[PDB]
Amino acid sequence: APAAVDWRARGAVTAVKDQGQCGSCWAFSAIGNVECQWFLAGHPLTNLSEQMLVSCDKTDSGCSGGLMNNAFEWIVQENNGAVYTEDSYPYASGEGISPPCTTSGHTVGATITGHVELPQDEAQIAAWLAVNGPVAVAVDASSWMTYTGGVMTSCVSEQLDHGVLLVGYNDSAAVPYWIIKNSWTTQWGEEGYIRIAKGSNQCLVKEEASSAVVG
Ligand SMILES: O=C(COc1ccccc1Br)NCCc1nc2ccccc2[nH]1
């Protein structure tokens, strides 16, 4: 695989979003992944709807949490593969109150037919990402609440608790790293991103990696 990849440089990643006071990171992770795959599949970069999942995916638990793998199954099995646009189904859960599901009246912004779950191995995840694009991952983010920049090398790695999006890596740096999109606005971290060291399972990053299949 190349020494370094950054899918932001490809124009494949939407702006950093704001989950607010809601445990909906699982939805931001899954939808951010779909956004990037939809662009890479030859379409304009389009903001897609986290609220669709938060309100309508009853396998997951709204502002009380969820799993990207369950979100991807819900989209395919319960929503005909459709992911609505952000503009037609905008995010409304920032104060912790998710509106009831509405089934009518939205605009389809992307279609997926499935998803992949990747091996629990940072090298294979990086090789997949280099060719195929950003990867949704679960992490332990408990120790991310003081991060202001640099490469994190001592991530507390004990319990998965947050969904995020791998968008790149750099194996040439003095400390090789992953580049991760969060959903805590651009006012946290490095314009909304964090670099964590790569190759030591920082933050349990290898454990639950996935990506949508557009089609
Ligand atoms: O909705 C998510 C998705 O993150 C994951 C969490 C666990 C596994 C995979 C993923 Br993705 N997190 C917010 C709600 C939450 N807070 C937790 C604190 C401690 C343990 C579990 C927790 N779940």
Spatial distance between the Cα atoms of 215 and 212, rounded to a whole number of angstroms: 10
What does the alpha-carbon distance between residue 194 and residue 141 come to, in Å, rounded to a whole number? 11
- Residue whose CB lies within 8 A of the most ligand 1 atoms, among 93, 120, 160, 184, for a mutation test: 160
Distance (Å, rounded) from C-alpha 90 to C-alpha 94? 11
Element (H, E) at 165: strand 162-170
CB 193 within 8 A of CB 9: no
Nearest to 204 by CA among 155, 145, 157: 157
Distance 24 CA to ligand 1 centre (A): 9
Among 22, 25, 63, 155, the one annotated catalytic:
25
Which domains are delineated in the chain?
Answer: 1-215 (3.90.70.10)
Residue 122 phi, psi dihedral angles, 5° rounding: -60, -35
Paired tokens of 215: 């089609």
CA distances from 20 to 31, 94, 111, 139 (A): 16, 4, 27, 18
Which residue reads 């695989």 in tokens?
Answer: 1
Buried b (16+ CB within 10 A) or exposed e, 29-44: bbbbbbbbbbbbeeee
Spatial neighbors of 206 by CB under 8 A, at least 6 apart, are 120, 121, 122, 125
101 is catalytic: no
User: Among 33, 170, 182, 203, which one carries the catalytic annotation?
Assistant: 182
- What type of residue is 119? P
Which atom of ligand 1 is closest in space to residue 64's alpha carbon? Answer: 14
- Confirm if 13 and 35 have CB atoms less than 8 A apart: yes
**C-beta of residue 8 within 8 angstroms of C-beta of residue 133:** no
Q: Which residues contact 187 (CB under 8 A, 6 or more apart)?
A: none
d(CA 13, CA 192): 12
Phi, psi of 50 (to 5 degrees): -65, -35
Whether residue 133 has its Cβ less than 6 Å from ligand 1: no
- What's phi and psi for 209, nearest 5 deg? -100, 135
State if residue 163 touches ligand 1 by the CB under 6 angstroms criterion. Answer: yes
146: its two tokens: 């003081």
Tell me how far apart the alpha carbons of residues 26 and 34 are, in angstroms, rounded to a whole number.
12
Strands 209-214 and 135-139: antiparallel
The pair of three-digit structure tokens given for residue 54, joined into one six-digit string: 């938060």
Distance of CA 94 to the CA centre of its chain: 17
Whether the CB-CB separation of 16 and 183 falls below 8 Å is answered with yes
Angstrom resolution of this structure: 1.3
CB 51 within 8 A of CB 22: no
Name the nearest CA neighbour of 203 among 149, 142, 151, 145: 142
- Contact present, 83 and 112 (Cβ < 8 Å): yes
Which residue blocks in the chain are alpha helix, DSSP H? 25-40, 50-56, 68-78, 122-132
Are the beta carbons of 100 and 203 closer than 8 angstroms? no
Q: For the chain, after which residues does the C atom lie more than 2.5 Å from the next written residue's N, i.e. where is it broken?
A: none
Characterize the bridge pairing of strands 193-197 and 177-181.
antiparallel
CA distance 92 to 126: 34
- State which approach was used to obtain the coordinates: X-ray
Measured CA to CA, the distance from residue 136 to residue 114 in angstroms comes to 14
CA distance 85 to 78: 17
**Known catalytic membership, residue 162:** yes
